[PDB]
Amino acid sequence: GIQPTFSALKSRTYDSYWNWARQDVLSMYFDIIFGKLTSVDRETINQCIQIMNRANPTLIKFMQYHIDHCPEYKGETYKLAKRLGQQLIDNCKQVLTEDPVYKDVSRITGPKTKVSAKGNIEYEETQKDSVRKFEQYVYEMAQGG
Amino acid sequence: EIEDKTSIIQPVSSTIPSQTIPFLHIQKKTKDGWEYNKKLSSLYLDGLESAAINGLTFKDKYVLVTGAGAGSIGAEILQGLISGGAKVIVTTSRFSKKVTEYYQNMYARYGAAGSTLIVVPFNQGSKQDVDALVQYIYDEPKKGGLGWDLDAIIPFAAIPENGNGLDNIDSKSEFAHRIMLTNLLRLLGAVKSKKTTDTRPAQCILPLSPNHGTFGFDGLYSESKISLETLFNRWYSEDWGSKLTVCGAVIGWTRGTGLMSANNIIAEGIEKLGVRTFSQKEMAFNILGLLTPEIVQLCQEEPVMADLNGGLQFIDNLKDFTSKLRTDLLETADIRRAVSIESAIEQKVVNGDNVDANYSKVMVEPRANMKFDFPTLKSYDEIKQIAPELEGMLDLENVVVVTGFAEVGPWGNSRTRWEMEAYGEFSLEGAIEMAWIMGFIKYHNGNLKGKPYSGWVDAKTQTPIDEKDIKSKYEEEILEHSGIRLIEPELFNGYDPKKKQMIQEVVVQHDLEPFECSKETAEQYKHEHGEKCEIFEIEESGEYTVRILKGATLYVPKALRFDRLVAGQIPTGWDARTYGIPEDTISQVDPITLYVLVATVEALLSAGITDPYEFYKYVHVSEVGNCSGSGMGGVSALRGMFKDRYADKPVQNDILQESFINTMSAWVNMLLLSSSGPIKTPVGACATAVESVDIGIETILSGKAKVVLVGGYDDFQEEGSYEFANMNATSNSIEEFKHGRTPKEMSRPTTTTRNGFMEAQGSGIQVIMTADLALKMGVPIHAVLAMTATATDKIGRSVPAPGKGILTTAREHHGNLKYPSPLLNIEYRKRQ
Amino acid sequence: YDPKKKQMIQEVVVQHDLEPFECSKETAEQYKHEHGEKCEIFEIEESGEYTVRILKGATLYVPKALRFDRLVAGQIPTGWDARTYGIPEDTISQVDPITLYVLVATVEALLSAGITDPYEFYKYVHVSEVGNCSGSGMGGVSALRGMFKDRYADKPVQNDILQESFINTMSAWVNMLLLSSSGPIKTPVGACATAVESVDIGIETILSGKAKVVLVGGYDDFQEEGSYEFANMNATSNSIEE
Amino acid sequence: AAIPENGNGLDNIDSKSEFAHRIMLTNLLRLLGAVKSKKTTDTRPAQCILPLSPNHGTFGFDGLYSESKISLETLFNRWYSEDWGSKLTVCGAVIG
Amino acid sequence: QLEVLARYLQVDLNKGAKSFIKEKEASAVLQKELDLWEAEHGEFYAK
Amino acid sequence: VKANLLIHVLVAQKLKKPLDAVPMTKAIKDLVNGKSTVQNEILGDLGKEFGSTPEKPEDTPLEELAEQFQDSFSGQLGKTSTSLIGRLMSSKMPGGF
Amino acid sequence: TSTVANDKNESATINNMMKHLGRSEGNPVFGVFQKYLTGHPKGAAGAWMLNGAIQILESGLVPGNRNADNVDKLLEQYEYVLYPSRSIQTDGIKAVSVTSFGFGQKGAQAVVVHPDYLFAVLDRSTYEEYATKVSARNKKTYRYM
Amino acid sequence: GDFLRRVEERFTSSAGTVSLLQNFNQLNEPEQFTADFFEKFPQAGKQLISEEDCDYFLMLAARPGQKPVPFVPVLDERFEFFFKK
Incomplete structure (x- = not known):
């Protein structure tokens, strides 16, 4: 176990957020028009934040072309991506010149252990009914239990 | 919901009931020990309310995070550091391709602007690594380091140890105690000595435990965690009070994967007491809230205990309590099992074993559905919504279209390259096609061990195999021996790259x-040694003896460990026997023309041309061209006339006629087409198969051909690989292994750390064709070649150095845009 | 290369x-490493260089020669020199001998067109319209002898010999040393009849409008290993029986 | 048994401190863990007398001394949780 | 004359010398493993 | 028992000729000579002894016999070999043997 | 082709020809980089790219350079080009550029337009007669293959 | 039925679906069964017989212990065995 594995020649710096902003905009853009993410879903809000955490001035010029030339006549999810895109274009202009933020929007999940009538033990970490954000989770943390 | 700084008007400090300790409380030391302080704990939670409704900033924060494996707490704080803008060193004790592509995906989604993530190999049970990694974080870029200065340290790394009792404290426990304690302190003690500035503290985040020996058999785990609590008092007593500020987190019940999957079944049970457990994204949230700028200032005057244990210290005998809840759910699960097992068989006794076979359903095994699938033709009223009023404008006798195409690549043909390209995974249809071309499965027909059989049978043992057992038995080996991998000596006549033979x-x-x-x-x-040898006849036999004398030149063999050990092979086991090339043409011809004949048929097949003579029903014989060509092709036959002939090895007599670049297009004509159309042969090095299109199109539009092949092909050999080494074009494979790169990832376009290309072999052919003759034959029009070009760059003295002469495909005149040009408008030309 | 004493190794x-x-x-x-067990090496500690003994059972390569048939070929005249045309001794010492024959041929073919300087086209035409659709049949045999025959002996060879082995690299030194153009580079390679298809690739380059000037050519070189392999195909005539 | 170590700070945890941590802790537990395996009788307990310290890092520069002494306090809770409750009974002394 | 008598009697004149240099790199291997202990742990712990 | 040694044995007793008199290269049809009840009985015996009989066993020679007891004729003496043995031994073999 | 000199020269050429022709600002082309997967088959390079360009045309998919560890920082100045590392299904690809740079100052460029822009210059009688012989040849090539 | 056991097996993919043909006694009224079977597989009515399912069909028609088939599927080595038989 003590055999030393460090070497400076093997470090892997990861930098190019300017690419992954211009990727994950248009990666989100076809998850909307092909219905793989609706506006009710919570991972589209997770990855609208991670785009405006990576906002550059040219990323808006990237987004604004794809929302101006999105064809609304092709469907109703094509209505969705122009509306949900332009709402993000208006947000990336504001968070521009501000400091990128960690806002976790994951839906709070708790444990539920149920035993099947055959006798199998299955663990479903289901969504909490009364605690649905970290806004409500911290309110749970103040109450004790 | 999408429509950012929401103000808070009633904080969580006012939400805490009296007499009630929160689930997450900061402690403060008095003389009696540690106990709950409401002032510090309300300042904690009001930051976490703002960290939830507004969020956290981590810009210009330099963190070290150790123990950050995929699916831990230490990887859910890395999503929360990097999303805030932190600059994190990440340690992996296992360094691989699947390890760092986890971290690349984690940066490609969460990498906020300003953030960097660095994955280093690091052992923490090594003293020599912890000395050398803080020399990599603090030293300057001119000495090879990073030039950072750490503003937080999170040393979470540990060993999974279990079953080590006190009588069995073993060597895995002495190595875990060194990882978790006696070299964690050397990690904090080395960031101290590299600091020279008392104005930059480094907030240590220590994963304390609330369970110090209250469980059972874990080895030196509790002795590793309880002695991290003495860094609270040692902050006062030693000279690092401004260098390292300690902020110990007490992580409660975290519900995660790994070895705690046997403990998730009772997290529901102890939550019924009024206690709470945590998922990993929650103890992500709970430790990242120890990095708020109000806690950060509080850690700089006080050592901070943050007891994030969610009420679990208010449970008497937690070991015996969680033991009975785990027993009772296991003792309920088997009595409900063994009753339903016995009641199942008791119905088999009464109702009979003939009936219960009719209770199970007949499931359907799936097969592969290899189709051919010409590209799906849209309907004509649909085709004019995609393209508006373009009807009757282009003359179809002057539009060139690719009507078929194929390859012999490192990933098989055009179908199984696209599955590895578009998806990274083979299908079921594409895994019996890589098993067909690599020669793993052979289609048996007739009698197999008495019984009649018609299906896929292995080639090594020759036993029947279902089509879903093609992936499950061979996806490990199809992937291991195809693509960019290290050169295998069987494919290149004994070429071992580690033992390249030379003569001295x-x-x-x-x-x-x-x-x-x-x-x-x-x-x-x-004759050829002259005086410096003797010959003498043996009169008894007629053969001569020869003595080599002093002063004559010999050639002694030698070898050298050569650099380039990796290249992109045609898949190991690819064989031209399996396509139907006769063993006549195999034994004559150089290996590259085998790759061109294979590619030419299944490119004609991609055009619906089952027989090459089906053109001549529509076109004349003098109008089927072959404007294909190679870059250097024939290297195996250039090795015959130059390297193999000088040794007087037994060589084919007409090797020079297969050395040519225009002779692979001969065997296409000699063995398939028998045509009289325009033969040409391009040879523009790398970019030769795009000028092959160029020579192809103007061959058609001039009217000299109506069908013409268009292609490119080249082969990998020993002497071709060594001479790209000395031009420093192909990357040194050995220095890729000091960088920890596997062969499937050292072919790196666009990259910051790209080092040269990866050389490969094979072919590629397209059957191009006029647009009207394509729709008069009924072939699949796959593409429309609108443009093609070639260009020579600028005066230089460096041939491998590229240039920009092809930028003049976009040349135009913008001196006067006052008048828009009339001729670009589609309705102007239509009325003309 | 003495054709009567063609050197081979046994x-x-x-x-x-x-x-x-x-x-x-x-x-x-x-x-x-490359003889394995069948040789010994021992260090001289006084000098640091090693002695090596080749043992019983190792393979040597003994030179030999053979009186070869083809003693006559149609040489560029003896004493022809690319010094006398003005090619610098920079490009002489780098480049394979056949591109010396192409540079010499390209200037005095432009001179046959009244082109005293290769940049006189660009007064009339654009730079992206001066092509070079010339090409060889096998050209670079002196640099294919470098990477295959001379490298295996570890003779002192130029490091970038492979980039002059190409057939599209003689048209590079025409562009690198004369034209500095951006027109359609192509390269035909149809064995014997390659300079008439070079016209063919040349004309439809012009009539398509892709070039207005284009070079058109053919060139190949005589060497030892190219001559021996036309002997075994029985294409060149046996000089001794002549 | 212990090693005299002094002047070993946190930046100078050295090899005399890794050898003192092995003497005082990670091989003291192997000493109590080996008298367990040689016992076969649950009627004879062996009273462990552990030299605990009341000064866990409250002094200065002593090396891994306080980390050796504070983790002998986890033998109190481990008596309940493991199978040596009748083999070794722990009686920790806190010497002033 | 010494080589041709050693050739006759099948006596290897360097069998001792070939086994000398083959154990000298074998004892260099265990030295390369032995100092990995002392570089990791240190001189006081190892003594 | 092997297919080659199986067919030969049964055929040897059917044709009442020495075991060498019947070359396994040829076919029963040409070996019998033309008898309608000769070839029919020959195949019949083997048919009930094995079960696996091809379309044209009368023409199947050499390989045919080997294929018959190939991915099948596993080591079983069958009824043909059993009946013959039991009968012959109790009709010729010494009393009690 | 994974070298220091090529991937900025190839990137500056696509940037400067898309700059000169009047792309909208914020419409990068998606760079696909097949040589990570297939290697550089030096003579055969442009064919594997032209096979890939047609496969991209029919599916509408855009593959990813799945060894883009970190795209070079010097490539952020090339705004009219995008560098994916993740396979992304688009709703339709009209034309694909295929550029190949060779030794000896040998550059090249193909443009591969989708087949449907050919199938709208011909009237209703010719297309529905065409689609029959394709469906005839597809079943006949099916039986052969 | 044992031919239709190949048709579900051919046109389903990676699934482990239960069969539409659980018992061969469902084939006692085929014309309403075959239509309901081939509405689950519209692509079976348009894709030709595969060659792996073509020599399978010939291996069903000449299987031992079966009634000989009332037609001829191939002109081959086995024609009279298909014909007079």
């Missing part, structure tokens, strides 16, 4: 003893 | 071991 000219200084040889060879030695 | 298995000869550090490690 040695002048003999003491004469060899005589060896017997034949008549003409002894006359060949005496 | 692989001879040694049956009685040679006596030790002294060599350098890495070469002795190269012998022991």
Whole structure:
């Protein structure tokens, strides 16, 4: 176990957020028009934040072309991506010149252990009914239990 | 919901009931020990309310995070550091391709602007690594380091140890105690000595435990965690009070994967007491809230205990309590099992074993559905919504279209390259096609061990195999022996890249003893060594002895460990037997033309041309061209006339006629087409198969051909690989292994750390064709070649160095945009 | 190259071991890797260079020669020199001999067109319209002898010999040293009849409008290993029976 | 048994401190863990007398001394949780 | 004359010398493993 | 028992000729000579002894016999070999043997 | 082709020809980089790219350079080009550029337009007669293959 | 039925679906069964017989212990065995 594995020649710096902003905009853009993410879903809000955490001035010029030339006549999810895109274009202009933020929007999940009538033990970490954000989770943390 | 700084008006400090300790409380030390302080704990939670409704900033924060494996707490704080803008060193004790592509995906989604993530190999049970990694974080970029200065440290790394009791404290427990404690302190003690500035503290985040020996058999785990609590008092007593500020987190019940999957079944049970457990994204949230700028200032005056244990210290005998909840759910699960097992068989006894076979359903095994699938033709009223009023404008006799195409690549053909390209995974249809081309499965027909059989049978044992057992038995081996991998000596006539054979000219200084040889060879030695050898006839046999004398030149063999050990092979087991090339043409012809014949049929097949003579029903024989060509092709036959002939190895007599670049297009004509159309042959090095299109299109639009093949092909050999090494074009494979790169990832376009390309072999052919003759034959029009070009760059003295002469495909005149040009408008040309 | 004394090597298995000869550090490690057990190496501690003994059973390559048939070929005239046309001794010492024959031929073909300087086209035409659709049949045989025959002996060879082995690289030195154009580069390679298809690729380059000036050519070189392999195909006539 | 170590700070945890941590802790537990395996009788307990310290890092520069002494306090809770409750009974002394 | 008598009697004149240099790199291997202990742990712990 | 040694044995007793008199290269049809009840009985015996009989066993020679007891004729003496043995032994073999 | 000199020269050429022709600002082309997967088959390079360009045309998919560890920082100045590392299904690809740079100052460029822009210059009678012989040849090539 | 056991097996993919043909006694009224079977597989009515399912069909028609088939599927080595038989 003590055999030393460090070497400076093997470090892997990861930098190019300017690419992954211009990727994950248009990666989100076809998850909307092909219905793989609706506006009710919570991972589209997770990855609208991670785009405006990576906002550059040219990323808006990237987004604004794809929302101006999105064809609304092709469907109703094509209505969705122009509306949900332009709402993000208006947000990336504001968070521009501000400091990128960690806002976790994951839906709070708790444990539920149920035993099947055959006798199998299955663990479903289901969504909490009364605690649905970290806004409500911290309110749970103040109450004790 | 999408429509950012929401103000808070009633904080969580006012939400805490009296007499009630929160689930997450900061402690403060008094003389009696540690106990709950409401002032510090309300300042904690009001930051976490703002960290939830507004969020956290981590810009210009330099963190070290150790123990950050995929699916831990230490990887859910890395999503929360990097999303805030932190600059994190990440440690992996296992360094691989699947390890760092986890971290690349984690940066490609969460990498906020300003953030960097660095994955280093690091052992923490090594003293020599913890000395050398803080020398990599603090030293300057001119000495190889990073030039950072750490503003937080999170040393979470540990060993999974279990079953080590007190009588069995073993060597895995002495190595876990060194990882978790006696070299964690050396990690904090080395960031101290590299700091020179008392204005930059480094907030240590220590994963304390609330369970110090209250469980059972874990080894030195509790002795590793309880002695991290003495860094609270040692902050006062030693000289690092401004260098390292300690902020110990007490992580409660975290519900995660790994070895705690046997403990998730009772997290529901102890939550019924009024206690709470945590998922990993929650103890992500709970430790990242120890990095708020109000806690950060509080850690700089006080050592901070943050007891994030969610009420679990208010449970008497937690070991015996969670033991009975785990027993009772296991003792309920088996009595409900063993009853339903016995009641199942008791119904088999009464109702009979003939009936219960009719209770199970007949499931359907799936097969592969290899189709051919020409591209899906849209309907004509649909085709004019995609393209508006373009009807009747282009003359179809002057539009070139690709009507078929194929390859012989490192990933098989055009179908199984696209599955590895578009998806990274083979289908079921594409895994019996890589098993077909690599020669794993052979289609048996007839009798197999008595019984009649018609299906896929292995080639090594020859036993029947279902089509879903093609992936499950061979996806490990199809992937291991295809694509960019290290050069296998069986594919290149004994070329071992580690033992590249060379000869050294040695002048003999003491004469060899005589060896017997034949008549003409002894006359060949005496002519070509001259005085410096002797020959003498054996009159009993007629063959001569020859003695090499002092001063004659010998050639002594040698070898050298050569650099380039990886290249992109045609898949190991690819064979031209399996396509139907006769063993006549196999034994004559150079290996690259085998790759061109294979590629030419299944490119015609991609055009619906089952027989190459089906063109001549529509076109004349003098109008089927072949404007294909190679870059260097024939390297195996250039090795025959230059390297193999000089040794007088037994070589084919007409090897020079397969060395040519226009002779692979001969075997296409000699064995398939029998045409009289325009043969040409391009040879523009790398970019030769795009000028092959260029020579292809103007061949068609001039009217000299109506069908013409268009292609490119080249082969990998020993002497071709060594000479790209000395031009420093292909990347040194050995220095890729000091960088920890596997062969499937050292072919790196666009990259910051790209080092040269990866050389490969094979072919590629397209059957291009006029647009109207394509729709008069009924072939699949796959593409429309609108443009093609070639261009020569600028005066230079460096041939491998590229240039920009092809930028003049976009040349136009913008001196006067006052008048828009009339001729670009589609309705102007239509009325003209 | 003496055609009467064409040098070949014969692989001879040694049956009685040679006596030790002294060599350098890495070469002795190269012998022991590539002969294996069948040789010994020993360090001289006084000098740091090693002795190596070749043992019984190792393979040597003994040189030989043979009186070869084809003694007559149609030489560029004896004393022809690319010094006398103005090619610098920079490009002489780098480049394979055939591109010397192409540079010489390209200027005095432009001179036959009244083009005293290759940049006189660009007064009339754009730079992206001066092509070079010339090409060779096998050209670069002197640099294919470098990477295949001269490299295996570890003779001192130019490092970038492979980039002059190409057939599209003689048209590079026309562009690198004369034209500095951006027109359609192509390269035909149809064996014997390659300079008439070079016209063919040349004309439809012009009539398509892709070039207005384009060079059109053919060139090839005579060497030892190219001559021996036309002998075994029985294409060139046996000079002795002539 | 212990090693005299002094002047070993946190930046100078050295090899005399890794050898003192092995003497005082990670091989003291192997000493109590080996008298367990040689016992076969649950009627004879062996009273462990552990030299605990009341000064866990409240002094200065002593090396891994306080980390050796504070983790002998986890043998109190481990008596309940493991199978040596009748083999070794722990009686920790806190010497002033 | 010494080589041709050693050739006759099948006596290897360097069998001792070949086994000398083959154990000298074998004892260099265990030295390369032995100092990995002392570089990791240190001189006081190892003594 | 092997297919080659199986067919020969049964055929040897059917044709009442020495075991060498019947070359396994040829076919029963040409070996019998033309008898309608000769070839029919020959195949019949083997048919009930094995079960696996091809379309044209009368023409199947050499390989045919080997294929018959190939991915099948596993080591079983069958009824043909059993009946013959039991009968012959109790009709010729000494009393009690 | 994974070298220091090529991937900025190839990137500056696509940037400067898309700059000169009047792309909208914020419409990068998606760079696909097949040589990570297939290697550089030096003579055969442009064919594997032209096979890939047609496969991209029919599916509408855009593959990813799945060894883009970190795209070079010097490539952020090339705004009219995008560098994916993740396979992304688009709703339709009209034309694909295929550029190949060779030794000896040998550059090249193809443009591969989708087949449907050919199938709208011909009237209703010719297309529905065309689609029959394709469906005839597809079943006949099916039986052969 | 044992031919239709190949048709579900051919046109389903990676699934482990239960069969539409659980018992061969469902084939006692085929014309309403075959239509309901081939509405689950519309692509079976348009894709030709595969060659792996073509020599399978010939291996069903000449299987031992079966009634000989009332038609001829191939002109081959086995024609009279298909014909007079």
